[PDB]
Symmetry: C2
Subunit: 107 residues, 2 copies
């Protein structure tokens, strides 16, 4: 629900959608494709390399954002849990007094 | 983390403050021996049990909140991770096709 997480989800959805457009392109291509001319078999080749590259880059940036959001979540959970443990341990020492003093009332 | 986290830490702090006061009274009490007769010893003992139960109760409730916070963070991380997995798989499928249509146009 955090807006940051929301931006990331949006960004992931947008990346998927661009991928989907490319899947459709590959299909149309397969219905006709390029042409056995050297200059342009090569030009098409470079075009695929460019596509693949851009895709890979976009993927790596998203992974970077995912890593950040998860690291923030982990940090929050750790703080929460650790505070809990400190609180529980302080109770363990209170409790010890209570009970003992309760003994001392006379033994 | 944010708001929820802040309130919980404050709650824990307030709880710890309450336990510091108690443990303080205990210090006074630590000595605070004035003999005692049945009815009053008995009412002192009871008074202990009651504080012991109150404390235990606060703790339990703090625990519940900690668990909820942690569950919320786990959920969000899972959403994040899962989307990431998704993008990557969608990418793997597209890459497979780009490499295929490239190669014809290559060798």
């Amino acid at each position: 629900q955090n807006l940051d997480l929301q931006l990331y989800m949006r960004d992931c959805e947008l990346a998927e959608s661009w991928m989907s457009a490319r899947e459709a392109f590959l299909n149309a291509d397969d219905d006709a494709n390029a042409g056995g001319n050297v200059e342009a078999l090569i030009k098409k080749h470079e075009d695929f390399d460019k596509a693949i590259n851009g895709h890979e880059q976009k993927i790596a940036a998203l992974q970077t954002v995912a890593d950040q959001l998860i690291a923030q979540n982990h940090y929050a959970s750790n703080l929460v849990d650790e505070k809990r443990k400190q609180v529980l341990e302080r109770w363990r020492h209170l409790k010890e007094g209570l009970i003992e003093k309760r003994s001392r009332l006379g033994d």
